[PDB]
Design a protein around this ligand. Structure first.
Ligand SMILES: Nc1ncnc2c1ncn2[C@@H]1O[C@H](COP(=O)(O)OP(=O)(O)O)[C@@H](O)[C@H]1O
Ligand SMILES: Nc1ncnc2c1ncn2[C@@H]1O[C@H](COP(=O)(O)OP(=O)(O)O)[C@@H](O)[C@H]1O
Ligand SMILES: Nc1ncnc2c1ncn2[C@@H]1O[C@H](COP(=O)(O)OP(=O)(O)O)[C@@H](O)[C@H]1O
Lengths: 212, 445, 442, 437
């Protein structure tokens, strides 16, 4: 199944059809279809005309990760709606601000209702890994599922580089700061009690769990 | 030029004079003099473009030419004006509401025209040099872009440099830059350097080397419909929804702000609006909610001229339970001016069959044309239109290039029509499954 | 510019503290209805009372929508106006009650005043100034950052806190750029490079902003107007964070979601707080729901208590049907397609049909708005055909007469042109008369 | 052995080259007029000139209209695309139902592309990337070894990085494709097996052919594959992955815009001469199951610029059309659509045609039936149904094999009649008993 459907082979036609359906006939190809690319370049104000081909041929998580902070062209039809201007005007705003305090109610509800000291109430009963797939007699399957379970860009994006390591590449190895593999994109849990499902046995629960 | 010979491929346009009067036969359309004059009035009203929200209706018997007139006004309107031809059933969608689908079809039919001046610098690159002093001068470089004929040397900037090195650029890539905006187009590897590597990358493409002047300057015009601005403004990477259909009920404030921006953009003269025609074929299959939204969707200045077709007489309006003229409620028929088509005589039928025969490249004898005229008068126009091609197939199976009366006789024998099928069903009702589901499958009893 | 079966309504034309002038504001006739709409507009501009409802009753082509547009025009552009059809509510993405509630919250407008203390200009020199006693084992020790800004007839040197340096270094701020900072936040926003310093004249990417006007130090008073639905949809979607979930929400299609009462209550709480501070101003706006006969019964049931709420604005209702069954129920025959429980809550304004003189004045008003020159005899013929068939059939027939006059190179609308354009474009009555006598169910 | 189906005895329409239909040819018997009409429309599809031609087949059940449609699909050949369909699968939950109709329309129209496949194969003898910094390597030189000799290869840095992502070192066996630039490692060489006594690396022998193999293929696609390959919402089928994707994409409505640009690119590649357009056949069976909305979207979508030759098949008489309460019509087809159709009728058979059908079915399903058993089967077929006798033909074979007898006798047919009932006898027993049969 694997060696005749998924991997390329001399008698298989996977790679040929893949290129023929993803490159030769992609409608965002500037080599064949220029005017459509120039059309969207006028619309979205994109600086590079290959960006539509890049977006059309990138997985969603990977395209989410390499998010670009570059501003667009200023002659575009991308007209920033008043909600985006409201969100960007309060991106780093102090307290005692009229537009500042209107646009954060979740932090007010957090601080008012004391959500920083609440306790975990639910833990799941069974936790499992993804179901393992076991193909006998090939190392390509082992490499493929080990790469897919532990993709270093996705794993490193849900990660953090240690501080002395960031010292080591930034000063000792001289790596520029913007060329670091990006980290810290894992969502913050609500509390320290919500971080992990394991609950320690509490001394106070021993004190309070008895009638006598 | 991917098309084949369809039903409406002979209709090149509304065959009118300079004072809006139809010819007896010109530019495809035969007869229908009053309706064609009315459609020409409609076309001139579209081309003036100073009137918004008119609703017009084409009513007639089946196979009389309402969609023929619609394709005529579409072809006479020409390009760079947005024309949208939807059906009644395309409104009903599971994850996109019907009223908002009407809003999508309304905003897809009015365009705004923007002119742009381009200064194209396209040619094969040779060398990118390093003039920076530990990135001093903001990573300055020198470019060696060449066409076939002339070669020149430029100096680039920091944004230009990390734009290129963000791309996969090296010597041999056919690259393109705007002089003004600096937009980067990496077309691919030049075809002259074809045998540099025996194996090539997946994204690598082979482009011919550009020939002539480097700094060509061209002005392009852009005609964008008003729905596309909402598409690209609703999301972040919104251009995908222009092609994948997952717009998903764009909110009303986005449309409001875009209308305000279009009014500002036209007030300063940098853009102008181009109104079009929203053609709704088979409008009788809209329920009362679609009609109630259509009645108030034609009172805005950003509303195209809606043209509808209906072959139903006094019929039941869907979504309700009362009879009504045209299959439409009376409040909609109050707002609409109705263009009426009429049936044809034998002469109009034989000229239409002659045009459709020349369109499908079938040469006809006179007797076959008269027999097809009689069959078109008796049964229907479209059956005699359909008989021509199968008669041609019978002719080449007989090793004759032209069709005689014998081929039309054989095609009439082999392929039936509506009335003969009705008679041959009512003759032998027992062999057919019916409304009560009872049938005698056995042959002998 | 463009004629869209409207725009002669410049207002009610009501006189102050009295009757309406007969031909003011583009309105002809309807003295009682225009007086009622003037009273309603006065009550709305008082801004004292919330949760009211007005229904306009009358036949087709009477002018209820024109009355609503007159209300919105006489209120002014500061007052929000949300025109709505009854079929808009049935969304297959979110429930209909949430759709009506968000259309309620869209009508309420909020204005907030403030002051913006900013430094704007073109940077001529920025210095990460060093410090005495530079700690130990550190690449730099920035005591402060001096920046030199240049604007039109203005130049300043700003001694900033050290924390602006990493924002400067991140945003690629160098000498030869136009920037725009804020005082209290201290966050740099780079507009671009200055216009004069287009030095790399061969190839460039970054657009060159002109050198900014005004002084280098500006204290402007920006007044921004928002709706309550804007605040709700801003608080609902997660702002900031930029941690996978928000970025996936930005890249994927937005989904209309059931906004709970808690979010609206918190929004109302903070809005009332800044209203009591005296810096914000709240201004309710009307909501116009047309063809209200076509809402289901559960929408009316929700509207019974949504109307009774504290913050919901007035809502204007329009219906043309008479004795009919309410949609969504079996045999509740009720006036105007509105169930009788709602009828006691709302006030009813009846609009009367016109006659020949009002029809001809409306026709000539629409012709002047369309900029078409029509004589008196053609005006009388069009009035007689309008009384004979309908008002709208005469109103939509003016433009084909103008086209047919243009074909024969005549500026004037003449009787033979209106007869010919009548022969081109039939009336619904005569089309129906064809339909009953049609052989092929035309 | 091969598995016999209900239509595996059909091979072609069996008409002569002159257009006349032979009586017993091609797995068909009888049905002369419908076979001649189907041959004519086969020639019409082979002419490749018009779009939107529509054919409705008429007749009662067990008349072989599905056999006619499959005979058309086999007379055209495997190169011409064919999309068989039943009316009930147009209704979907993910995407709207007219969109499913347009998807099947674009599925029927097909494209033919020629292509060359160039493969480099063998053991990695040397691997030396030249950096030439001005981190970013300039290129890489790669030596590949096979049993017929060795070669050396020059590669761009992108395929070098892809080589690095298959953990390729010296001694590995790889797959290099010249055009697509895809890399697939096979395993370490057999000559490097004894470096350690036991190691996780899969050991594979050297390719006994040459390193450089070339072949020419003909990639046959349809327009649906083309306009779904870039109508992708989430992005990312270019990665080749085993585990499931994070977001499961839905079938989405395909706008007119992308279809127009796909038409533009296909027309450009056609004018470049690399492609050959071929119209196909969309065969929708059970047309009575179609809703009225699909009928009028079909009418509307039959007149588009590019459209296949649609063949329709129904058995109903004067029935109400589905979705409306009062419109009666022949064949369940509304009058506006039935004006556009050309109706071809299929006639029922007499007893000798049934006997010949049963004999040919007995030949193809690998049995041997005696003549008197064939006569009883023909009488049973005329009495009850053709399909009942055709399906009862095989349990006779099971009962004959049970008694170690290769030939079917009359007693086998009688015993199968006792074992299995038709619809009519079971309906009679259903009527006689009370408590739910
Ligand atoms: N004026 C005309 N000139 C030429 N052909 C016509 C004309 N009117 C109708 N037809 C023929 O009628 C067919 C389509 O008619 P159509 O407009 O679909 O009928 P209906 O108005 O009932 O929908 C086309 O194949 C076309 O050849
Ligand atoms: N009293 C009036 N004065 C001026 N114009 C009017 C008046 N009544 C109606 N009209 C015009 O008649 C046209 C149709 O009226 P409409 O608003 O559709 O009536 P309704 O509100 O009953 O639907 C509109 O363009 C409107 O401007
Ligand atoms: N003229 C014929 N010659 C040979 N076999 C036939 C003929 N007509 C029908 N059949 C056979 O009858 C079988 C069932 O017919 P089928 O197509 O299911 O009937 P229907 O047309 O009602 O669907 C088919 O497998 C076909 O092989």
């Amino acid at each position: 199944i694997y060696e005749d459907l998924i991997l390329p082979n001399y008698n298989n036609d996977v790679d040929i059809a893949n290129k023929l359906k993803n490159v030769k006939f992609n409608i965002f190809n500037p080599s064949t279809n220029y005017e459509l690319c120039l059309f969207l370049s006028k619309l979205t104000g994109e600086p590079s005309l290959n960006e539509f081909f890049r977006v059309s041929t990138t997985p969603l998580l990977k395209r989410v990760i390499e998010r670009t902070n570059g501003p667009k062209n200023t002659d575009s039809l991308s007209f920033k709606t008043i909600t985006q201007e409201l969100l960007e005007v309060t991106r780093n705003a102090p307290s005692e601000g009229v537009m500042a305090s209107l646009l954060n109610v979740e932090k007010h509800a957090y601080e008012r209702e004391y959500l920083n000291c609440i306790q975990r109430g639910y833990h799941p009963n069974v936790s499992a890994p993804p179901v393992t797939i076991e193909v006998l007699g090939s190392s390509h399957v082992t490499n493929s599922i080990n790469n897919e379970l532990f993709d270093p860009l996705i794993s490193q994006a849900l990660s953090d580089i240690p501080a002395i390591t960031q010292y080591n590449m930034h000063v000792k190895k001289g790596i520029p700061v913007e060329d670091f593999p990006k980290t810290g994109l894992f969502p913050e849990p609500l509390n320290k009690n919500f971080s992990s499902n394991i609950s320690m046995p509490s001394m106070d629960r021993f004190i309070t769990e008895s009638a006598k | 030029s991917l098309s084949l010979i369809a039903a409406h491929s002979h209709i090149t346009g509304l065959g009118l004079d300079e004072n809006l009067q139809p010819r007896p036969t010109s530019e495809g359309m035969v007869g229908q003099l009053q309706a064609r004059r009315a459609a020409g009035v409609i076309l001139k009203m579209v081309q003036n473009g100073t009137i918004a929200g008119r609703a017009v209706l084409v009513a007639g018997p089946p196979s009389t030419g309402k969609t023929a007139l619609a394709m005529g006004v579409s072809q006479s309107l020409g390009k760079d004006v947005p024309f949208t031809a939807i059906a009644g059933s395309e409104i009903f969608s599971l994850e996109l509401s019907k009223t908002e689908a009407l809003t999508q079809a309304f905003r897809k039919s009015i365009g705004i025209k923007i002119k742009e001046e381009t200064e194209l610098i396209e040619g094969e690159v040779v060398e990118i040099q390093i003039d920076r002093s530990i990135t001093g001068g903001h990573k300055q470089g020198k470019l060696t872009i060449k066409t076939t004929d002339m070669e020149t040397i430029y100096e680039l900037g920091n944004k230009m440099i990390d734009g290129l090195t963000k791309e996969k650029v090296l010597a041999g890539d056919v690259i393109s830059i705007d002089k003004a905006s600096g937009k980067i187009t990496k077309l691919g590897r030049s075809f002259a350097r074809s045998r540099d590597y025996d194996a090539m990358g997946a994204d690598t493409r082979f482009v011919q080397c550009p020939e002539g002047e480097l700094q060509k300057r061209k002005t392009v015009v852009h005609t964008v419909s008003l729905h596309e601005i909402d598409v690209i403004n609703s999301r972040t990477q919104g251009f995908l929804a222009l092609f994948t259909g997952d717009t998903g009920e764009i909110r009303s404030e986005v449309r409001d702000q875009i209308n305000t921006k279009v009014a500002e953009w036209k007030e300063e003269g940098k853009a102008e609006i181009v109104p079009g025609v929203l053609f709704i074929d088979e409008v009788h299959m809209l329920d009362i909610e679609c009609f109630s939204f259509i009645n108030r969707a034609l009172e805005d200045e950003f509303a195209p001229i809606v043209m509808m077709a209906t072959n139903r007489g006094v019929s039941k309006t869907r979504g309700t339970n009362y009879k009504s003229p045209h299959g439409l409620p009376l409040d909609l028929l109050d707002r609409s001016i109705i263009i009426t088509t009429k049936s044809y005589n034998e002469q109009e039928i034989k000229t239409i069959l002659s045009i459709r025969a020349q369109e499908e490249e079938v040469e006809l004898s006179s007797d076959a044309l008269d027999l097809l005229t009689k069959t078109g008068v008796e049964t229907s126009l479209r059956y005699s239109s359909n008989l021509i091609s199968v008669a041609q197939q019978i002719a080449m199976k007989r090793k004759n290039n032209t069709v005689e009366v014998e081929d039309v006789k054989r095609a009439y024998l082999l392929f039936l029509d509506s009335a003969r099928s009705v008679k041959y069903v009512q003759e032998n009702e027992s062999q057919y499954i019916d409304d009560q589901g009872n049938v005698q499958i056995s042959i002998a009893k | 510019t463009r004629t869209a079966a409207h725009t002669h309504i410049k207002g009610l034309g009501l006189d102050e503290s009295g009757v309406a002038k007969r031909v003011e504001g583009g309105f002809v006739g309807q003295i009682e209805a225009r007086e009622a709409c003037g009273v309603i507009v006065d009550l709305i501009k008082a801004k004292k009372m919330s949760g009211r409802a007005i229904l306009l009753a009358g036949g087709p082509s009477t002018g209820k929508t024109a009355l609503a547009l007159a209300i919105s025009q006489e209120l002014g552009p500061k007052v929000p106006f949300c025109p709505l059809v009854g079929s808009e509510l049935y969304s297959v993405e979110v429930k209909k009650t949430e759709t009506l509630m968000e259309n309620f919250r869209r009508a309420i407008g909020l204005r907030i005043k403030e002051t913006k203390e900013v430094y704007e200009g073109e940077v001529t020199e920025l210095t990460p100034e060093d410090a005495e006693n530079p700690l130990g084992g550190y690449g730099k020790t920035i005591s402060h950052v001096i920046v030199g800004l240049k604007s039109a007839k203005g130049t300043k040197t700003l001694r900033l806190d050290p924390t602006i340096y990493e924002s400067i270094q991140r945003e690629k701020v160098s000498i030869g750029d136009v920037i725009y900072i804020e005082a209290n936040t201290g966050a740099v926003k780079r507009v671009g490079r200055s216009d004069a310093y287009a030095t790399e004249f061969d190839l460039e990417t970054e657009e060159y902003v002109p050198l900014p006007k005004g002084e280098v130090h500006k204290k402007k008073e920006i007044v921004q107007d928002v709706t309550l639905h804007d605040l709700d949809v801003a608080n609902a979607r997660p702002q900031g964070g930029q941690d996978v979930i928000s970025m996936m929400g930005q890249l994927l299609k937005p989904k209309k979601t059931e906004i709970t009462e808690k979010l609206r209550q918190e929004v109302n709480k903070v809005v009332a707080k800044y209203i009591d501070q005296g810096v914000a101003e709240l201004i309710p706006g009307v909501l116009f729901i047309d063809e209200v006969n076509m809402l289901d019964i559960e929408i009316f049931t929700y509207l019974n208590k949504a109307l009774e709420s504290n913050i919901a604005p007035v809502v204007v209702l329009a219906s043309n049907r008479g004795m009919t069954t309410v949609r969504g129920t079996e045999d509740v025959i009720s006036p105007h397609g509105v169930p009788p429980d709602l009828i006691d809550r709302l006030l009813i304004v009846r609009t009367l049909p016109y006659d020949k003189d009002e029809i001809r004045t409306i026709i000539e008003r629409r012709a002047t708005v369309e900029r078409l020159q029509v004589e008196s005899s053609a005006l009388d013929l069009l009035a007689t055909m309008g009384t004979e068939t309908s008002l709208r059939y005469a109103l939509q027939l003016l433009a084909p007469c103008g086209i047919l006059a243009q074909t024969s190179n005549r500026k004037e609308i003449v009787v033979n042109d209106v007869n010919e354009a009548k022969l081109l474009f039939l009336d619904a009555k005569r089309s129906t008369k064809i339909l009953e006598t049609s052989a092929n169910y035309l």
